Design a protein around this motif. Structure first.
Motif, PDB file in Angstrom:
ATOM      1  N   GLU A  19       3.534   5.665   4.745  1.00 49.75           N
ATOM      2  CA  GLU A  19       3.187   6.867   5.536  1.00 49.75           C
ATOM      3  C   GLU A  19       4.104   7.013   6.778  1.00 49.75           C
ATOM      4  O   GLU A  19       4.371   8.141   7.228  1.00 49.75           O
ATOM      5  CB  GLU A  19       1.697   6.883   5.915  1.00 49.75           C
ATOM      6  CG  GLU A  19       1.188   5.661   6.697  1.00 49.75           C
ATOM      7  CD  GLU A  19      -0.252   5.888   7.125  1.00 49.75           C
ATOM      8  OE1 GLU A  19      -0.451   6.651   8.098  1.00 49.75           O
ATOM      9  OE2 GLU A  19      -1.176   5.446   6.400  1.00 49.75           O
ATOM     10  N   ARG A  20       4.614   5.881   7.307  1.00 47.14           N
ATOM     11  CA  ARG A  20       5.521   5.953   8.466  1.00 47.14           C
ATOM     12  C   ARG A  20       6.788   6.772   8.095  1.00 47.14           C
ATOM     13  O   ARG A  20       7.295   7.503   8.942  1.00 47.14           O
ATOM     14  CB  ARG A  20       5.892   4.540   8.968  1.00 47.14           C
ATOM     15  CG  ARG A  20       6.724   4.532  10.265  1.00 47.14           C
ATOM     16  CD  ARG A  20       6.951   3.114  10.750  1.00 47.14           C
ATOM     17  NE  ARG A  20       5.686   2.491  11.160  1.00 47.14           N
ATOM     18  CZ  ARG A  20       5.329   2.239  12.417  1.00 47.14           C
ATOM     19  NH1 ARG A  20       6.157   2.510  13.419  1.00 47.14           N
ATOM     20  NH2 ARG A  20       4.140   1.711  12.681  1.00 47.14           N
ATOM     21  N   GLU A  21       7.262   6.699   6.820  1.00 45.46           N
ATOM     22  CA  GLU A  21       8.409   7.486   6.361  1.00 45.46           C
ATOM     23  C   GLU A  21       8.105   8.990   6.508  1.00 45.46           C
ATOM     24  O   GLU A  21       8.982   9.764   6.878  1.00 45.46           O
ATOM     25  CB  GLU A  21       8.732   7.164   4.896  1.00 45.46           C
ATOM     26  CG  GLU A  21       9.981   7.846   4.369  1.00 45.46           C
ATOM     27  CD  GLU A  21      10.167   7.721   2.872  1.00 45.46           C
ATOM     28  OE1 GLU A  21       9.380   6.995   2.222  1.00 45.46           O
ATOM     29  OE2 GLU A  21      11.121   8.338   2.350  1.00 45.46           O
ATOM     30  N   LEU A  22       6.860   9.400   6.226  1.00 45.01           N
ATOM     31  CA  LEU A  22       6.504  10.812   6.408  1.00 45.01           C
ATOM     32  C   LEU A  22       6.540  11.170   7.897  1.00 45.01           C
ATOM     33  O   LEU A  22       7.222  12.111   8.281  1.00 45.01           O
ATOM     34  CB  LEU A  22       5.106  11.086   5.834  1.00 45.01           C
ATOM     35  CG  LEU A  22       4.875  10.738   4.352  1.00 45.01           C
ATOM     36  CD1 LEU A  22       3.486  11.169   3.929  1.00 45.01           C
ATOM     37  CD2 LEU A  22       5.912  11.399   3.443  1.00 45.01           C
ATOM     38  N   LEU A  23       5.877  10.368   8.738  1.00 47.29           N
ATOM     39  CA  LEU A  23       5.825  10.608  10.187  1.00 47.29           C
ATOM     40  C   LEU A  23       7.227  10.712  10.796  1.00 47.29           C
ATOM     41  O   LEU A  23       7.493  11.625  11.588  1.00 47.29           O
ATOM     42  CB  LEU A  23       5.025   9.483  10.869  1.00 47.29           C
ATOM     43  CG  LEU A  23       4.923   9.537  12.414  1.00 47.29           C
ATOM     44  CD1 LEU A  23       4.340  10.887  12.891  1.00 47.29           C
ATOM     45  CD2 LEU A  23       4.050   8.398  12.933  1.00 47.29           C
TER      46      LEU A  23
ATOM     47  N   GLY C 136       6.834  15.080   2.103  1.00 50.10           N
ATOM     48  CA  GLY C 136       5.490  15.056   1.547  1.00 50.10           C
ATOM     49  C   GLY C 136       5.444  13.955   0.504  1.00 50.10           C
ATOM     50  O   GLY C 136       6.464  13.320   0.195  1.00 50.10           O
ATOM     51  N   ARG C 137       4.277  13.733  -0.052  1.00 52.43           N
ATOM     52  CA  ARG C 137       4.053  12.666  -1.010  1.00 52.43           C
ATOM     53  C   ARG C 137       3.520  13.218  -2.316  1.00 52.43           C
ATOM     54  O   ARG C 137       2.554  13.986  -2.307  1.00 52.43           O
ATOM     55  CB  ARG C 137       3.045  11.658  -0.403  1.00 52.43           C
ATOM     56  CG  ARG C 137       2.599  10.571  -1.345  1.00 52.43           C
ATOM     57  CD  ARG C 137       1.642   9.595  -0.669  1.00 52.43           C
ATOM     58  NE  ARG C 137       2.365   8.777   0.305  1.00 52.43           N
ATOM     59  CZ  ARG C 137       1.773   7.963   1.172  1.00 52.43           C
ATOM     60  NH1 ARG C 137       0.447   7.880   1.215  1.00 52.43           N
ATOM     61  NH2 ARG C 137       2.498   7.233   2.009  1.00 52.43           N
ATOM     62  N   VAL C 156       5.616   8.709  -4.651  1.00 57.56           N
ATOM     63  CA  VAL C 156       6.958   8.942  -4.150  1.00 57.56           C
ATOM     64  C   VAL C 156       6.922   9.906  -2.972  1.00 57.56           C
ATOM     65  O   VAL C 156       6.159  10.862  -3.005  1.00 57.56           O
ATOM     66  CB  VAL C 156       7.974   9.350  -5.258  1.00 57.56           C
ATOM     67  CG1 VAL C 156       7.751  10.791  -5.723  1.00 57.56           C
ATOM     68  CG2 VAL C 156       9.414   9.118  -4.775  1.00 57.56           C
ATOM     69  N   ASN C 157       7.712   9.629  -1.916  1.00 60.45           N
ATOM     70  CA  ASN C 157       7.817  10.530  -0.764  1.00 60.45           C
ATOM     71  C   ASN C 157       9.126  11.305  -0.927  1.00 60.45           C
ATOM     72  O   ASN C 157      10.166  10.702  -1.236  1.00 60.45           O
ATOM     73  CB  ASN C 157       7.801   9.753   0.544  1.00 60.45           C
ATOM     74  CG  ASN C 157       6.519   8.994   0.777  1.00 60.45           C
ATOM     75  OD1 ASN C 157       5.424   9.374   0.310  1.00 60.45           O
ATOM     76  ND2 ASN C 157       6.622   7.921   1.541  1.00 60.45           N
ATOM     77  N   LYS C 205       0.752  14.203   5.825  1.00 58.95           N
ATOM     78  CA  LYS C 205      -0.214  13.688   6.795  1.00 58.95           C
ATOM     79  C   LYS C 205       0.069  14.367   8.121  1.00 58.95           C
ATOM     80  O   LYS C 205       1.132  14.173   8.709  1.00 58.95           O
ATOM     81  CB  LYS C 205      -0.123  12.145   6.908  1.00 58.95           C
ATOM     82  CG  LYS C 205      -1.157  11.603   7.897  1.00 58.95           C
ATOM     83  CD  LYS C 205      -1.287  10.090   7.836  1.00 58.95           C
ATOM     84  CE  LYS C 205      -2.290   9.635   8.883  1.00 58.95           C
ATOM     85  NZ  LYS C 205      -2.671   8.195   8.768  1.00 58.95           N
ATOM     86  N   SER C 206      -0.853  15.214   8.581  1.00 56.78           N
ATOM     87  CA  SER C 206      -0.618  15.904   9.830  1.00 56.78           C
ATOM     88  C   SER C 206      -0.484  14.906  10.991  1.00 56.78           C
ATOM     89  O   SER C 206      -1.380  14.088  11.198  1.00 56.78           O
ATOM     90  CB  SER C 206      -1.748  16.881  10.135  1.00 56.78           C
ATOM     91  OG  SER C 206      -1.588  17.341  11.465  1.00 56.78           O
TER      92      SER C 206
END
Ligand SMILES: CN(C)[C@H]1CCN(C(=O)[C@H](CNC(=O)c2ccc(Cl)s2)NS(=O)(=O)c2cccc(N3CCCCC3=O)c2OC(F)F)C1
Ligand SMILES: *[C@@H]1O[C@H](CO)[C@@H](O)[C@H](O)[C@H]1NC(C)=O
Ligand code: NA
Ligand code: NA
Lengths: 27, 10, 250
Positions: A19-23, C136-137, C156-157, C205-206
């Motif tokens: 999730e850190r990659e998204l942030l 996004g994922r 996958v992101n 994820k906001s």
């Protein structure tokens, strides 16, 4: 009202492996 | 390939 | 999912598997948006070129899963469909424009560590997050390659791509109800959704409220993970008026 909050992660303040990659992309 | 699911769902 | 990794337990508790009753097989991905509603791609239920036109009784929805093939006793929940709702302007003839469908469950699903709904975006969430470069994922039990199958849920992101780049990657007409995502050949990173992932969620994820939002639905790609091609996703916010109309009316 409790949508998008994961019992095994957000609810316990644990982060998943990527999730850190998204942030980091949210500049 | 898929494991059999309980009869109740079919 | 191509070039992804195994999901962690409860990483995507809104993941839903659309499962054919006879023969028993994976049909598509989907997502849990409330205790009685599941979101997916319209092409998962209706695609006349492939002689696909499912009725409620042909399918099951399997929620809380991790393993692709195993019956996850005391973990997963198997639900029957009460009614399928396909967007009335879903364009199966041309480009899969408005590739969205809702499925109402016969009974509410109980939430658990493994089962929990994802949020749907409002206008401000969409404007904030749906930006080129933002990742996004995507998750699913689909093929690991264009031309095998995973043991467990894959993740996958992928970054959202600029509209001109999406348009220039294909001969298909791209609409405002779609967005595309994935790495450019020069980025040195790869990944994509593939056959079997269609209908599954593209989530973000906001960073404002730390909630996961489903921004897209896995819709189509010219093959899977090809250099210079991108995955196309239904723009969930653009179709929110229809989603709300269905949930309000039935
Ligand atoms: C199209 N619908 C019904 C389902 C059936 C197979 N689908 C495909 O897009 C396949 C496999 N690749 C994928 O599913 C995905 C890859 C990336 C994302 Cl995101 S989804 N790609 S394909 O190359 O084999 C393919 C096979 C049959 C149909 C299509 N499409 C989709 C776009 C509109 C017209 C069309 O014929 C199609 O995509 C291609 F045009 F881009 C989705
Ligand atoms: C799909 O099937 C229903 C009957 O279950 C039928 O009324 C409808 O016309 C079919 N749609 C297409 C496009 O074949
Ligand atoms: Na083009
Ligand atoms: Na690609």
């Amino acid at each position: 009202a409790d949508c998008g909050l994961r019992p095994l992660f957000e609810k316990k303040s644990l982060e998943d492996k990527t999730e850190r990659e998204l942030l980091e992309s949210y500049i | 390939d898929f494991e059999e699911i309980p009869e109740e769902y079919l | 999912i191509v070039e992804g990794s195994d999901a962690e337990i409860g990483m995507s508790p809104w993941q839903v598997m659309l499962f054919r009753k006879s023969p028993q097989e994976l049909l598509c991905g989907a997502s849990l948006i409330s205790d009685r509603w599941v979101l997916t791609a319209a092409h998962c239920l209706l695609y006349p070129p492939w002689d696909k036109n499912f009725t409620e009784n042909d399918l099951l929805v399997r929620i809380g899963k991790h393993s692709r093939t195993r019956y996850e006793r005391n973990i997963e929940k198997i639900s029957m469909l009460e009614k399928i709702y396909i967007h009335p302007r879903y364009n199966w003839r041309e480009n899969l424009d408005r590739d969205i469908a809702l499925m109402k469950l016969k009974k509410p699903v109980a939430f658990s560590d493994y089962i929990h709904p994802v949020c749907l975006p409002d206008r401000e969430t969409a404007a904030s997050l749906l930006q080129a470069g933002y990742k996004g994922r995507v998750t699913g039990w689909g093929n690991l390659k264009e031309t095998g199958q995973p043991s467990v849920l894959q993740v996958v992101n992928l970054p959202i791509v600029e509209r001109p780049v999406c348009k220039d990657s294909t001969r298909i007409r791209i609409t405002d109800n779609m967005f595309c995502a994935g790495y450019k050949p020069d980025e040195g990173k790869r990944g994509d959704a593939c056959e079997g992932d269609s209908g599954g969620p593209f989530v973000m994820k906001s960073p404002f409220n730390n909630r996961w939002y489903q921004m897209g639905i896995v819709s189509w790609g010219e093959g899977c993970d090809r250099d210079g091609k991108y995955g196309f996703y239904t723009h969930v916010f653009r179709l929110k008026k229809w989603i709300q109309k269905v949930i309000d009316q039935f």
